[PDB]
């Protein structure tokens, strides 16, 4: 390096820093990925149960 025009310097390298990023959820494998073909998805649901039986 050169300080001004007639003087020299000592160069000590560079310092770098990056921000944090969290990855807790990705480590839990909690989601399942599907690859479709269009921008519409359909889901179907079914319910069932039981009932009473009165005396006869």
């Amino acid at each position: 390096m050169q300080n001004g025009d007639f003087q020299i310097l000592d160069y000590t390298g560079l310092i770098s820093t990056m921000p944090r990023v969290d990855t807790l959820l990705q480590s839990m494998n909690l989601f399942t990925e599907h690859f479709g073909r269009t921008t519409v998805a359909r889901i179907e649901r079914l319910d069932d149960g039981a009932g009473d039986i009165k005396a006869v």
Binding site: E44, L46, I53, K54, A55, V56
Partner: protein, 55 residues
């Protein structure tokens, strides 16, 4: 007091009882109009069938 009198016992106890029982029916019927055209739910194009309904 000695010699004079005595005392006696008591003769137990008993009882008897009877009951009745109820009756619980339950029936279910199926017909053609239920399973003719309807899709087998959960499938894209499979037609309905009687066995799924019966089970």
């Amino acid at each position: 007091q000695r010699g004079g009198v005595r005392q006696h016992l008591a003769n137990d106890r008993k009882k008897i009882v009877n009951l009745n029982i109820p009756f619980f029916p339950l029936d279910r019927s199926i017909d053609r109009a239920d399973i003719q055209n309807f899709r087998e739910f959960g499938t894209e194009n499979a037609p309905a069938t009687v066995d799924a309904e019966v089970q």
